[PDB]
UniProtKB/Swiss-Prot annotation, chain A:
This is Actin-related protein 5. Component of the chromatin-remodeling INO80 complex, at least composed of ARP4, ARP5, ARP8, RVB1, RVB2, TAF14, NHP10, IES1, IES3, IES4, IES6, ACT1, IES2, IES5 and INO80. It is found in: Nucleus. PANTHER family: ACTIN. The modification Phosphothreonine is found at T13. Keywords: Isopeptide bond, Nucleus, Phosphoprotein, Transcription, Transcription regulation, Ubl conjugation. Pfam families: Actin. Probably involved in transcription regulation via its interaction with the INO80 complex, a chromatin remodeling complex. The keyword Transferase does not apply. Present with 2170 molecules/cell in log phase SD medium.
Swiss-Prot record, chain B:
Coiled coil: none annotated. It is found in: Nucleus, Nucleoplasm. Probably forms a homohexamer. Interacts with RVB1 and may form heterododecamers with RVB1. Component of the SWR1 chromatin remodeling complex composed of at least ACT1, ARP4, RVB1, RVB2, ARP6, YAF9, VPS71, VPS72, SWC3, SWC4, SWC5, SWC7 and SWR1, and perhaps BDF1. Component of the chromatin-remodeling INO80 complex, at least composed of ARP4, ARP5, ARP8, RVB1, RVB2, TAF14, NHP10, IES1, IES3, IES4, IES6, ACT1, IES2, IES5 and INO80. Also belongs to the R2TP complex composed of at least RVB1, RVB2, TAH1 and PIH1. Interacts with SPT15/TBP. The chain holds residues 130 to 243 of 471 of the full protein. It comes from Saccharomyces cerevisiae (strain ATCC 204508 / S288c) (Baker's yeast). Present with 3030 molecules/cell in log phase SD medium. The lineage of its organism: Eukaryota, Fungi, Dikarya, Ascomycota, Saccharomycotina. The gene is RVB2. This is RuvB-like protein 2.
From Swiss-Prot, chain C:
Probably forms a homohexamer. Interacts with RVB2 and may form heterododecamers with RVB2. Component of the SWR1 chromatin remodeling complex composed of at least ACT1, ARP4, RVB1, RVB2, ARP6, YAF9, VPS71, VPS72, SWC3, SWC4, SWC5, SWC7 and SWR1, and perhaps BDF1. Component of the chromatin-remodeling INO80 complex, at least composed of ARP4, ARP5, ARP8, RVB1, RVB2, TAF14, NHP10, IES1, IES3, IES4, IES6, ACT1, IES2, IES5 and INO80. Component of the R2TP complex composed of at least RVB1, RVB2, TAH1 and PIH1. Interacts with SPT15/TBP and HSP90. It is found in: Nucleus. DNA helicase which participates in several chromatin remodeling complexes, including the SWR1 and the INO80 complexes. The SWR1 complex mediates the ATP-dependent exchange of histone H2A for the H2A variant HZT1 leading to transcriptional regulation of selected genes by chromatin remodeling. The INO80 complex remodels chromatin by shifting nucleosomes. Its ability to induce transcription of some phosphate-responsive genes is modulated by inositol polyphosphates. The INO80 complex is involved in DNA repair by associating to 'Ser-129' phosphorylated H2A histones as a response to DNA damage. The chain holds residues 132 to 242 of 463 of the full protein. It comes from Saccharomyces cerevisiae (strain ATCC 204508 / S288c). This is RuvB-like protein 1.
Swiss-Prot record, chain D:
The gene is IES6. Keywords: Nucleus, Transcription, Transcription regulation. It is found in: Nucleus. The chain holds residues 28 to 162 of 166 of the full protein. Present with 1720 molecules/cell in log phase SD medium. This is Chromatin-remodeling complex subunit IES6. Component of the chromatin-remodeling INO80 complex, at least composed of ARP4, ARP5, ARP8, RVB1, RVB2, TAF14, NHP10, IES1, IES3, IES4, IES6, ACT1, IES2, IES5 and INO80. GO terms for cellular component: Ino80 complex; nucleus. The keyword DNA-binding does not apply. One of its GO terms (biological process) is chromatin remodeling. Probably involved in transcription regulation via its interaction with the INO80 complex, a chromatin remodeling complex. Also involved in the regulation of telomere length. Belongs to the IES6 family.
Length: 442, 104, 103, 125
């Protein structure tokens, strides 16, 4: 049969707000400022309380003549208000800040906070790796001026995931982060991220969904129905997996014995022989094609792209980026840096190999861990013990890193920026700790 | 029974490029059949194998990649021996059946 | 009846760095297979036999430890797209270990 | 009954201009557009200005150094239509293709302007 795909169903119930009686002005607030989703909550719980997409709408009511505002899960109430959702993020940075300020007001209201003269709670926050300082300057200008915050900490979400899975703060491992807009490989030595050797690949989930959109508009140019971003998102989430060997899987995926099991057909919503044709098997699969059928004219065949869309993070040159993959950067880090001659591993290299951690929201693709393990046995000396760990939900480990850092009171004060340091040092001053950024200069 | 992958078509045009010192040789070869046409980027040993046993335009040749032996089949029917242009795919996996006596 | 042991290294060459003591004292060869990599010190006679087969970086080779014979299988598949047309055959990586022991 | 339901979520989440959360002193500045492409350019202008100032102590960490370097191993060639292994490249429009059937069905009768958006996926335009 042919399955059908629609937009995801809307939320029947809106997001509730926390009780105001349980508020205290001493507990910090941990906010993960992610491009795809926003996670926030109080530190005393292990799991975050509020998770919603990072979007806002200025809904206008004709009979009221007012500009109503729907944020996050409030946008999951109408199809028109879901289609009009605008994210504050443009790429890997933040462009406009009024949307961010109104979103911050919304999540301050919904957390059950009764503040006066600004927010009385310290703020945990995320910052991207090697961020242009205009973004952190505007973050200071929001927080320390408008929100009257006592203390704000900056860090990287992958290092916070490493702290969550290694609470001692003195471990050594390799962090691979698969985010929405970038892919990062950061080595950690003695609990501190060596940011002079971290690497970034300009690819994420958004670029993979856009790759699927361009491929699918290319394969069938005469398709009548236009489908949205969410439909490409759900067939990316549903029928994409990482091949164990790409150079072997390509040469047999058009064989007739392979499309009997490894072919999925979906349907757009609306209301001499072909056995030797490679193009017919690529377009309409292993079945005969009825060109006069209305239902068969609304069908989408996924045979090659299931292993081709998630593969771009290993070969970035397919996506148009002249960068190396995760395997090549990991090989360079573990075999040519940190005092490791190629063919003779150092102790730091062995300790980094033994604690490889995968995190991020794009790590849910099946077959990623086994493929990474196979490559890691590929370029390492024989008998080297390789351990690769991945949580059940790697999209939430950064907030648990916030909770684990703010619970641990000893090294918490090494990262807090108070108001006094902000006024005395100005806005261009970086707290050089383990979980945060570093100075641009020596 | 053994199988060997072969390339056989008609040569359209050949470029040989030399540097200022001539240390590095770059080349491009355009070869076609009755069903397709393609352009190949040549390495150094392909360039030395085509300069030796001189191949011009309109020449029908057979190229073995794994052994480096190239044979001229003839000349194409182009007035502007004479062999017709090959057909089908340029890169054919062909099976040859060998018979060898025990004395050999 | 003689009882002998066959010892074979095979795989893709990753490092071939000779050094002089001109006379070379030793060469160090790094071999790579699908189950890991392994580096070896070599005597200069096997370096001469390596130079006999015109072995460069990326060639899958065959070294017998006791006899010292060197056989060049061919270039690896990872370097098969350096040119669109070349006179070099391409073989895949060995799926087993580099070290093999047999009585 | 449906159009009246969003009004309830509207009056539940309304915040007035005297906002209860931000501080008493506002001094809200004017905001430019500040597009995403512009930020990297003004960043490299800034570190280039600082490098020319310091040259006439030496920095090592910049935004070029974090970005992943290009690969050393040769890349894999793939068909631009099917995504299979690309053996041949057409000499007219430089589009890789798998076999003869794909060539005669797609590459030869193609309209112009579609070859650039073919090569856009791997960025070869």
């Amino acid at each position: 049969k042919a399955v059908v795909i629609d937009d995801p169903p809307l939320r029947q119930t809106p997001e509730p707000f926390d009780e105001q009686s349980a508020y205290n002005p001493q507990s910090p607030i941990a906010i993960d400022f992610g491009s795809s989703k926003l996670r926030a909550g109080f530190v005393n719980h292990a799991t975050p309380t509020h998770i919603f997409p990072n979007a806002l709408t200025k809904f206008r009511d004709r009979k009221l003549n007012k500009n109503f505002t729907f944020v996050g899960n409030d946008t999951l109430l109408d199809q028109a208000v879901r289609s009009q959702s605008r994210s504050p993020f443009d790429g890997p940075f933040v462009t406009n800040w009024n949307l961010t300020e109104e979103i911050l007001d919304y999540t301050f209201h919904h957390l059950g906070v009764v503040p006066d003269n600004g927010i009385p709670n310290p703020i945990l926050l995320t910052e991207r790796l090697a961020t242009v300082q205009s973004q952190r300057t505007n973050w200071y200008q929001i927080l320390f001026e408008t929100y009257n915050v006592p203390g704000v900490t900056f860090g990287i979400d992958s290092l916070f995931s490493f702290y969550n899975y290694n609470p001692s703060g003195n471990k050594t491992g390799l962090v691979i982060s698969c985010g929405h807009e970038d892919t990062n490989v950061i080595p950690v030595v003695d609990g501190a991220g060596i940011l002079t050797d971290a690497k970034r690949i300009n690819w994420g989930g958004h670029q993979a969904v856009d790759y699927l959109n361009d491929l699918m508009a290319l394969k069938y140019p005469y398709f009548p129905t236009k489908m949205s971003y969410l439909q490409y998102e759900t067939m990316y989430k549903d029928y994409c997996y990482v091949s164990r060997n790409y150079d072997e899987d390509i040469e047999k995926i058009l064989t007739l014995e392979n499309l009997d099991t490894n072919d999925v057909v979906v349907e757009a919503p609306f209301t001499y022989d072909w056995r030797n044709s490679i193009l017919h098997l690529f377009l309409r699969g292993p079945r005969p094609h009825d060109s006069e059928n209305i239902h068969e004219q609304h069908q989408m065949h996924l045979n090659v792209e299931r292993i081709r869309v998630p593969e771009v993070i290993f070969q970035p040159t397919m996506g148009g980026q002249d960068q190396a993959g995760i395997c090549e950067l990991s090989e360079t880090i573990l075999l040519k840096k940190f005092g490791s001659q190629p063919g003779k591993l150092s102790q730091t290299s062995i300790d980094m190999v033994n604690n490889v951690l995968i995190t991020g929201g794009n790590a849910k693709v099946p077959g990623l861990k086994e493929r990474i393990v196979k490559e890691f046995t590929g370029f390492l000396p024989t008998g080297t013990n390789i351990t690769v760990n991945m949580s059940s939900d790697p999209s939430l480990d950064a907030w648990k890193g916030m909770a684990a850092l703010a619970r641990n009171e000893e090294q918490y004060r090494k990262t807090v920026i108070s108001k006094k340091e902000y006024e005395e040092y100005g806005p261009e001053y970086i707290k050089e700790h383990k979980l945060g950024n570093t100075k641009y200069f020596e | 029974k053994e199988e060997t992958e072969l390339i056989e078509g008609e040569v359209v045009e050949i470029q040989i490029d030399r540097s200022i010192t001539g240390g590095h040789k770059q080349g491009k070869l355009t070869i076609k059949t009755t069903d397709m046409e393609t352009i190949y980027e040549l390495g150094n040993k392909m360039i030395d194998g085509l300069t030796k046993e001189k191949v011009l335009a309109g020449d029908v040749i057979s190229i073995d990649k794994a052994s480096g032996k190239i044979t001229k089949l003839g000349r194409s029917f182009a007035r502007s021996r004479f062999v017709q242009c090959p057909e089908g795919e340029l890169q054919k996996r062909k099976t040859v059946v060998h018979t060898v006596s025990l004395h050999e | 009846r003689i009882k002998e042991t066959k010892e074979v290294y095979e795989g893709e060459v990753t490092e071939l760095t000779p050094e002089d003591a001109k006379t070379i004292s030793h060469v160090i060869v790094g071999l790579k297979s699908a189950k890991g990599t392994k580096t070896l010190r070599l005597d200069p006679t096997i370096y001469e036999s390596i130079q006999r087969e015109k072995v460069s970086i990326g060639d899958v080779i065959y070294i017998e430890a006791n006899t010292g014979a060197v056989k060049r299988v061919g270039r690896s598949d990872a370097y098969a797209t350096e040119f669109d047309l070349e006179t070099e055959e391409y073989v895949p990586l060995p799926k087993g270990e580099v070290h093999k022991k047999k009585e | 009954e449906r159009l009246l339901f969003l009004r309830s979520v509207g009056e539940r989440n309304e915040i007035g201009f005297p906002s209860r959360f931000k501080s008493a002193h506002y001094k809200k500045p004017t905001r430019r557009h500040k597009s995403a492409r512009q930020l990297i350019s003004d960043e490299n202008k800034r570190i280039n200005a600082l490098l020319t100032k310091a040259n006439k102590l030496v920095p090592k960490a910049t935004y070029f150094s974090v970005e992943a370097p290009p690969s050393i191993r040769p890349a894999k060639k793939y068909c631009d239509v099917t995504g299979l292994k690309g053996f041949y490249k057409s000499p007219t429009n430089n589009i890789r293709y798998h076999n003869a059937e794909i060539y005669q069905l797609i590459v030869k009768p193609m309209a112009p302007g579609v070859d650039q958006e073919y090569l856009k996926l791997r960025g070869a335009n």
